[PDB]
Protein backbone atom coordinates (compact mmCIF):
# COMPACT_ATOMS: atom_id res chain seq x y z
CA UNK A 210 0.00 0.00 0.00
CA UNK A 211 2.69 2.65 0.99
CA UNK A 212 5.66 2.47 -1.35
CA UNK A 213 9.06 3.93 -0.71
CA UNK A 214 11.51 4.76 -3.48
CA UNK A 215 14.81 6.49 -3.89
CA UNK A 216 14.84 8.35 -7.17
CA UNK A 217 18.27 9.23 -8.50
CA UNK A 218 18.08 12.63 -10.11
CA UNK A 219 20.51 14.89 -11.88
CA UNK A 220 20.30 18.61 -12.39
CA UNK A 221 19.08 19.85 -9.04
CA UNK A 222 21.61 22.47 -7.96
CA UNK A 223 20.12 25.17 -5.77
CA UNK A 224 18.22 25.38 -2.53
CA UNK A 225 15.41 27.09 -4.33
CA UNK A 226 15.18 24.21 -6.79
CA UNK A 227 15.12 21.75 -3.94
CA UNK A 228 12.42 23.67 -2.13
CA UNK A 229 10.20 23.94 -5.18
CA UNK A 230 10.49 20.29 -6.15
CA UNK A 231 10.02 19.16 -2.59
CA UNK A 232 6.79 21.10 -2.32
CA UNK A 233 5.47 20.03 -5.70
CA UNK A 234 6.13 16.37 -5.06
CA UNK A 235 4.95 16.51 -1.45
CA UNK A 236 1.66 18.10 -2.43
CA UNK A 237 0.74 15.40 -4.86
CA UNK A 238 -2.15 13.45 -3.41
CA UNK A 239 -0.77 10.24 -1.91
CA UNK A 240 2.76 11.53 -1.44
CA UNK A 241 3.63 11.71 2.22
CA UNK A 242 7.32 11.89 3.15
CA UNK A 243 9.74 13.55 0.71
CA UNK A 244 13.44 14.33 1.12
CA UNK A 245 15.81 15.67 -1.46
CA UNK A 246 19.58 15.48 -0.96
CA UNK A 247 21.15 18.26 -2.93
CA UNK A 248 24.62 16.76 -2.93
CA UNK A 249 23.78 13.40 -4.35
CA UNK A 250 20.51 14.12 -6.11
CA UNK A 251 18.57 11.43 -4.29
CA UNK A 252 14.89 12.02 -3.85
CA UNK A 253 13.35 9.71 -1.29
CA UNK A 254 9.61 9.47 -1.37
CA UNK A 255 6.90 7.56 0.49
CA UNK A 256 3.66 7.41 -1.39
CA UNK A 257 0.46 5.57 -2.18
CA UNK A 258 -2.22 5.53 -4.88
CA UNK A 259 -3.14 7.83 -6.52
CA UNK A 260 0.53 8.79 -6.51
CA UNK A 261 2.84 6.44 -8.30
CA UNK A 262 6.45 6.39 -9.34
CA UNK A 263 5.65 7.46 -12.84
CA UNK A 264 3.66 10.54 -11.79
CA UNK A 265 6.40 11.57 -9.30
CA UNK A 266 9.00 11.13 -11.97
CA UNK A 267 6.96 13.14 -14.42
CA UNK A 268 7.04 16.08 -12.00
CA UNK A 269 10.82 15.76 -11.78
CA UNK A 270 11.06 15.86 -15.52
CA UNK A 271 8.55 18.70 -15.82
CA UNK A 272 10.77 20.82 -13.60
CA UNK A 273 13.67 20.22 -15.93
CA UNK A 274 15.65 17.50 -14.19
CA UNK A 275 16.65 13.99 -15.26
CA UNK A 276 16.57 10.62 -13.66
CA UNK A 277 18.88 7.67 -13.75
CA UNK A 278 16.75 4.61 -14.32
Ligand SMILES: [Ca+2]
Nearest residue numbers: 219220221222
Ligand atom coordinates in the same frame (compact mmCIF):
# COMPACT_ATOMS: atom_id res chain seq x y z
CA1 LIG B 1 24.73 22.98 -13.81
